[PDB]
Amino acid sequence: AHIVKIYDTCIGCTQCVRACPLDVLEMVPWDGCKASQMASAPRTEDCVGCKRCETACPTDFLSVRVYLGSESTRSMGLSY
Amino acid sequence: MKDFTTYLSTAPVIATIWFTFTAGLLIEINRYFPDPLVF
Amino acid sequence: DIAGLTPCSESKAYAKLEKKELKTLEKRLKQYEADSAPAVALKATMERTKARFANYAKAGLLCGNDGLPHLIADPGLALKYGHAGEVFIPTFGFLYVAGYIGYVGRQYLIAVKGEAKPTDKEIIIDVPLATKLAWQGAGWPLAAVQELQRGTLLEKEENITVSPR
Amino acid sequence: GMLETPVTSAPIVATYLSNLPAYRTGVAPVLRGVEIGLAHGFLLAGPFIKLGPLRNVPETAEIAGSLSAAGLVLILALCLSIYGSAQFQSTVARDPLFSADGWSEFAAGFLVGGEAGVAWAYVCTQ
Amino acid sequence: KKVKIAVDRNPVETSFEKWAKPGHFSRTLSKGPNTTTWIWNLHADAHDFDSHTSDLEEISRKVFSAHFGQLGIIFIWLSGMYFHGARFSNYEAWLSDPTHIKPSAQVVWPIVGQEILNGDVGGGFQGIQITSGFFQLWRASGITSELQLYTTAIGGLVMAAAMFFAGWFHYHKAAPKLEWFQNVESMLNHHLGGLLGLGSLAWAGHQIHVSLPVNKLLDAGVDPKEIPLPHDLLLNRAIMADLYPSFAKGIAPFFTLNWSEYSDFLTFKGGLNPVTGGLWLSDTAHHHVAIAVLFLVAGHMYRTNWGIGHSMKEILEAHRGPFTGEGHVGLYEILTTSWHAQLAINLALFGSLSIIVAHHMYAMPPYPYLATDYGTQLSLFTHHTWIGGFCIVGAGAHAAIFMVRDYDPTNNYNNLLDRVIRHRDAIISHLNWVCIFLGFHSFGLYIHNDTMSALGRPQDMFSDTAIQLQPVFAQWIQNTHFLAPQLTAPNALAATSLTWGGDLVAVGGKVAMMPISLGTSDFMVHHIHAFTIHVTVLILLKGVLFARSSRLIPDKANLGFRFPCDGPGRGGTCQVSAWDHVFLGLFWMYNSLSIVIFHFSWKMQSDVWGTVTASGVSHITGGNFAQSANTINGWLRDFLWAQSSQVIQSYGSALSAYGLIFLGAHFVWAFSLMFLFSGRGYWQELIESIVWAHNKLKVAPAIQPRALSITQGRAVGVAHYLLGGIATTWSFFLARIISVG
Amino acid sequence: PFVPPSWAPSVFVPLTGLVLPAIAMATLFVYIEKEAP
Amino acid sequence: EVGPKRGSLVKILRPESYWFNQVGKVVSVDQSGVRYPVVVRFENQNYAGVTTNNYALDEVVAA
Amino acid sequence: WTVPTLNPDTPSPIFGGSTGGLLRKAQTEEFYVITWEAKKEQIFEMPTGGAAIMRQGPNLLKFGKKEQCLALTTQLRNKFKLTPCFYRVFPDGKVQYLHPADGVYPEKVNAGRVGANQNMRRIGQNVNPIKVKFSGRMMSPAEI
Numbered sequence A: 001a002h003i004v005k006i007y008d009t010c011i012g013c014t015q016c017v018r019a020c021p022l023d024v025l026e027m028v029p030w031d032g033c034k035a036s037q038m039a040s041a042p043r044t045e046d047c048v049g050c051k052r053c054e055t056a057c058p059t060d061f062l063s064v065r066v067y068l069g070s071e072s073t074r075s076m077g078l079s080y
Numbered sequence B: 001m002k003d004f005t006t007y008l009s010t011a012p013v014i015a016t017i018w019f020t021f022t023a024g025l026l027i028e029i030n031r032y033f034p035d036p037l038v039f
Numbered sequence C: 001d002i003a004g005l006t007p008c009s010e011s012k013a014y015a016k017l018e019k020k021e022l023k024t025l026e027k028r029l030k031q032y033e034a035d036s037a038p039a040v041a042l043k044a045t046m047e048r049t050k051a052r053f054a055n056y057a058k059a060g061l062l063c064g065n066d067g068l069p070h071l072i073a074d075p076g077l078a079l080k081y082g083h084a085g086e087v088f089i090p091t092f093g094f095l096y097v098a099g100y101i102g103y104v105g106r107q108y109l110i111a112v113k114g115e116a117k118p119t120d121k122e123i124i125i126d127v128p129l130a131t132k133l134a135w136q137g138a139g140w141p142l143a144a145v146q147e148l149q150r151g152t153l154l155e156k157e158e159n160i161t162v163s164p165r
Numbered sequence D: 001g002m003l004e005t006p007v008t009s010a011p012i013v014a015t016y017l018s019n020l021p022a023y024r025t026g027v028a029p030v031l032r033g034v035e036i037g038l039a040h041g042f043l044l045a046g047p048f049i050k051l052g053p054l055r056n057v058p059e060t061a062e063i064a065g066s067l068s069a070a071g072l073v074l075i076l077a078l079c080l081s082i083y084g085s086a087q088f089q090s091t092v093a094r095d096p097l098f099s100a101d102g103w104s105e106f107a108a109g110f111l112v113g114g115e116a117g118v119a120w121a122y123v124c125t126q
Numbered sequence E: 001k002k003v004k005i006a007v008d009r010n011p012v013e014t015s016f017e018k019w020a021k022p023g024h025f026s027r028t029l030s031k032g033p034n035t036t037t038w039i040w041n042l043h044a045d046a047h048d049f050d051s052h053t054s055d056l057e058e059i060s061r062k063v064f065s066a067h068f069g070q071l072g073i074i075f076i077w078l079s080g081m082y083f084h085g086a087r088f089s090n091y092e093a094w095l096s097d098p099t100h101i102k103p104s105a106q107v108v109w110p111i112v113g114q115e116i117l118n119g120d121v122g123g124g125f126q127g128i129q130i131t132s133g134f135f136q137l138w139r140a141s142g143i144t145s146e147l148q149l150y151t152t153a154i155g156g157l158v159m160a161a162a163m164f165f166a167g168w169f170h171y172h173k174a175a176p177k178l179e180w181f182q183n184v185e186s187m188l189n190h191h192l193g194g195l196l197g198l199g200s201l202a203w204a205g206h207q208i209h210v211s212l213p214v215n216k217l218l219d220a221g222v223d224p225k226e227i228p229l230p231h232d233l234l235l236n237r238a239i240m241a242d243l244y245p246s247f248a249k250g251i252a253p254f255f256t257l258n259w260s261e262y263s264d265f266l267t268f269k270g271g272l273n274p275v276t277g278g279l280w281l282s283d284t285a286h287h288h289v290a291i292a293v294l295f296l297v298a299g300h301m302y303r304t305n306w307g308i309g310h311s312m313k314e315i316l317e318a319h320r321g322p323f324t325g326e327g328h329v330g331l332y333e334i335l336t337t338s339w340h341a342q343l344a345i346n347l348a349l350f351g352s353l354s355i356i357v358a359h360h361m362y363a364m365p366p367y368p369y370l371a372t373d374y375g376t377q378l379s380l381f382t383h384h385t386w387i388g389g390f391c392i393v394g395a396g397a398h399a400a401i402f403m404v405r406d407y408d409p410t411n412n413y414n415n416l417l418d419r420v421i422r423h424r425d426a427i428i429s430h431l432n433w434v435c436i437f438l439g440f441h442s443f444g445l446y447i448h449n450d451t452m453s454a455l456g457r458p459q460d461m462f463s464d465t466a467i468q469l470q471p472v473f474a475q476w477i478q479n480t481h482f483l484a485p486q487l488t489a490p491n492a493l494a495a496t497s498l499t500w501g502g503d504l505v506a507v508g509g510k511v512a513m514m515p516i517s518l519g520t521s522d523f524m525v526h527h528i529h530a531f532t533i534h535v536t537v538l539i540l541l542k543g544v545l546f547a548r549s550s551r552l553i554p555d556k557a558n559l560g561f562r563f564p565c566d567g568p569g570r571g572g573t574c575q576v577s578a579w580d581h582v583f584l585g586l587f588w589m590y591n592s593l594s595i596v597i598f599h600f601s602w603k604m605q606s607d608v609w610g611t612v613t614a615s616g617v618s619h620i621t622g623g624n625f626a627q628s629a630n631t632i633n634g635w636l637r638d639f640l641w642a643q644s645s646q647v648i649q650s651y652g653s654a655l656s657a658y659g660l661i662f663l664g665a666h667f668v669w670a671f672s673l674m675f676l677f678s679g680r681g682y683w684q685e686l687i688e689s690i691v692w693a694h695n696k697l698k699v700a701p702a703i704q705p706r707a708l709s710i711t712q713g714r715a716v717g718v719a720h721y722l723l724g725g726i727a728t729t730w731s732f733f734l735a736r737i738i739s740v741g
Numbered sequence F: 001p002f003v004p005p006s007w008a009p010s011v012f013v014p015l016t017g018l019v020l021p022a023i024a025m026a027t028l029f030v031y032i033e034k035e036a037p
Numbered sequence G: 001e002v003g004p005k006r007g008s009l010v011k012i013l014r015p016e017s018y019w020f021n022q023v024g025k026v027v028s029v030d031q032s033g034v035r036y037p038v039v040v041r042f043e044n045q046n047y048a049g050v051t052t053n054n055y056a057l058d059e060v061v062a063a
Numbered sequence H: 001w002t003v004p005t006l007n008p009d010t011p012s013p014i015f016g017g018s019t020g021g022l023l024r025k026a027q028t029e030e031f032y033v034i035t036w037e038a039k040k041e042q043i044f045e046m047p048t049g050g051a052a053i054m055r056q057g058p059n060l061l062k063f064g065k066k067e068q069c070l071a072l073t074t075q076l077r078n079k080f081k082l083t084p085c086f087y088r089v090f091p092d093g094k095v096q097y098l099h100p101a102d103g104v105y106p107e108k109v110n111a112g113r114v115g116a117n118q119n120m121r122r123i124g125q126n127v128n129p130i131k132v133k134f135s136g137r138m139m140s141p142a143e144i
Ligand code: CLA
Pocket: C074, C075, C076, C077, C078, C080
């Protein structure tokens, strides 16, 4: 499975969660930013690695990173 | 007229006029001084 | 002379090539009239060929075994045997015009960088400023040397972005 | 859900497919292999006989074609055996053909049937 | 329901204010540039009218005015061709000797030694030998002097000014409404009757009154100066009556249904003119008359403002069978509201028509002294073929654009389009299998022949001497067409063309047209053509059907029509957009059309074109197509290596320019490989280092330099690939056909 | 002497070209698709 | 009152930032104990088209 | 809020069928089932290709992968303003609720969610790969 990591530079804009096409990320309460929210990846077994979340992240540098790992039926997005 | 001059000041028009001027100068130099190889 | 070459004024292959070019031009001219447009154009081409060969031989160029002129790029040989007009003088001429263009462009960028929208001036060229800088760029070597000596030509390392290594 | 068409839903083609040995579901796999091998070897002997490099020389075109078809049947039998070994390794009614022993017997039956079909096609031209 | 002229007065004010604000048409580009990408975007979305606004009326108005601008450009180009033929050509000299004087209409200035390009074309003229065929067209129209061409050039300039004025007037002063553009019935009626029918009738009138008598006197040996002027022929009935006796009766036999009296200038001769080598102008005039009547009849089919006529919506809705569900329901609304769907249909039929034009033009030469001009024939066939292929790829592109932007599932519940998208997997899978079958059975024959020839076994090859594959169907069709004038065409004096069979027609010692025999090599190259066309169709169809969704990316429609990818996920989703399918289809179209033009060139130079001697005909290549086109080595040696001699040794002559382009075209094509095999990440980092060097010397531009986008990189690569390859073939073909033909 | 017989190529070339690659491909194919316990 | 003054120009010290060693205008500084309270706006956009970012107190220097 | 239970006897939208449906993976590995409530009969676009008609009330559909279910969820939420939910079904009959996992959509923060895969540092603070070398397998410095 791919490795999805969230960093402390996240501003809690929830743009990465809305851009995820397989429901891998979510928002959890936090205290390190004004939005009082932080991105999380509790369902990385369903991540395909499209990196749409990185495209939707506005922080410099990115707060969410996807490292392509082992490949399975779910990570390869195979319907067969 | 101000807008027309501003349009003429755009990069493609300026590049076209400048390259036409430079090419014309080189062509006229080679026409009045045919086959220049050395100084 | 240099590299075992011979002057074009004494090369037999040079004169042979001139005769060959004039021969093919005359052969093409033999099929037309004597007072028509192709005849006049061919005669003009023949005169241009003769003038070009005489001018190349008069310039003192060196010809090889093929009868074609050969250029000398070494400054010592060029200045010692009168070949500076091949590669030396055109070198400095190009350096002057190239530095002219580069200096004018750099001056324009520095001039428009202190405005409200420099990108707008980059896409829509300010003709009066560009013309003034183009005319003032004649003293580009002196101005460039002065800028280099004052330390204003380069930018400090702390003001230039770099990768995280 | 799926797309149904008269080509895949006609009862005539369904009966024709069910009548084939591969879709019998209840006979011995070795018998199925023998039938399939005979039906394949008989048709396989043709191209090598009429188009091989020795197709113009007489009294040996059929010999070379039949030998080539026999070699192809042997290669196909080896392919069936390795397919069965690499497909069934662990774990209506279940067809016994889709098993290690079933597919091995099927491959052996295919080899015997294919060689018999090639030999029968050779003598049929004499 | 009412067809009328709906126009809004002064919608857009004519001003130069927006000329100084680049990117005003786009909301994103109106902000201004910050990076260099913006500049490219400024040109990539200039004509994307549906992307600037969602108002169909504004898009239609912009399209209509853009059409006027295009017609003005075309009129300027035509006027330039007529002006060049009237002031810098040898048309008048070529008229007195069209079999020896080479057509030329371009002269270069004597600068930097380029005057060598002004070759000796004949007639006491020096210039560049043209291959557009304007000389033959002007001779067919009856033009005998440069004054007529000059007058036509001035008229073309006037027409161009009128086209530009029409575009400005229709965009800024009187802009048509949306309901005016949606009158497909009225538009089709006018285009069928008025445009096509009236144009054919007017051209038939010109041919009957100008082309036929002038060309009859020209073929009879009369000097062009002694031939009466067209107005003199149109003013008195004595000259026309002497040339055509039926003119003595006037237009009376036309109204009394005595059309048979006009058989002197309206015939069914067929074949070709033995004097000029082209089609009989009486046949072309009669052809245009019949075409005009047929199109005029066709222009009275649709309902506009009266009860009579047809409603295309009713016709489409009435066609419904048990195997297609609803049928053509919603197709009328799709074609009356989406410009991309109409562009797709029009581009497909337009490209197919261009290819048909190329074939019919080489087979039945319609202009005098056109068949013997091998350079013009080869250039015309190749040019029209390329235009047709490009238009076909564009048709696939716009079909995909419609499917991505204008498709609506609420109007396609169970129509033909809905069912096609439902079984797109089956369609693509079967087309994939037939493509693989065709590739094996077409290319494997050549590979087998190459291997057998190299192994010293020519008896095992797929040739005429060895195992043969004769095209029995094509040969039977050829025999049927050759025998048609005796049983199935009693009124036809000869066949439509000489390619079917019969005797050869030669003009000036050169074979104008002779029968074309088909053998094993023809069969193999035809299957090669079928395979290449099938693969191009597969890529374009796959890009259209899977443009909205697929098993890999279920929401592709949300990503748009032109997007680079969807990330390296799912194993990699590089080039999934329909744009990338068009990008690959361009390469396949180039491959297909290149093999097509190669086959045409070799077949014509081997079995058709050549000189005529005493008791025998000698071809250009000596008839080596039937023996060498069955192997790849034969195409590489006898066609590519042997015929490229003329372009590589062209230096020092008038064709040297072709050789230069032949080298330049090899450069551009290779240049394409830099953009097609690389990615923008490397270039962006390299640009970062160059920007560092610029920042060090305070010469960093305000507009941040960015590497080309992924889509732009693919577009640049395919553009350079197509330009380099087509220019290479163009230089090779023109140099070879001008030097030996 | 180490000289091979005259019939050595007629036996070794078909072996190395068809028998050995078939055995190697079959054994390798079985090894690649073998499932771990 | 903690952090740089609003509207002042600062230099970015974050190595992985696109605007490293570049000057940007200060927009606002958060008064809580957040990790990156300084908001900096830049004239040149990054590769993602963004012109603003958040930085810590020690990641920006008055330049 | 409580986890819902799949109702296999739920009507499916009116669709004539297509070739982009389920494959052998649904019968041997797993498949997905999406259910939603529609206020009225409406024509929507199927993620596998084609146009279907959702009926008034409950609607059930089957897909081969989770991406198809989420694409349909996004389409139903953004266009018709509905609230769909899906499950992963195994051949043995096991049903696993997937989205929204906690009953609330992940774009909005909800109490009770425990953060996972969160690094309390930035990217620039990651160590070099040499410090991660000779580990159990290929490991990136971000994994530690
Ligand atoms: C870009 C690289 C380059 C290269 C590869 C050369 C190569 C050469 N140069 Mg040279 N030169 C260059 C740049 C270069 N030069 C530049 C930029 C200048 C301007 C300052 C000169 C000015 C120059 C002069 C004035 C002379 C040479 C000479 C020579 C030749 C022999 C001397 C030598 O090798 O030492 C390297 C060259 C130098 C260090 C420059 C000084 C010259 C040294 C001291 C040798 C001179 C002594 C004597 C003339 C040697 C020849 C003896 C006899 C055959 C007459 C040699 C082929 C000599 C020559 O053969 O005359 C025809 C000569 O006198 N060059």
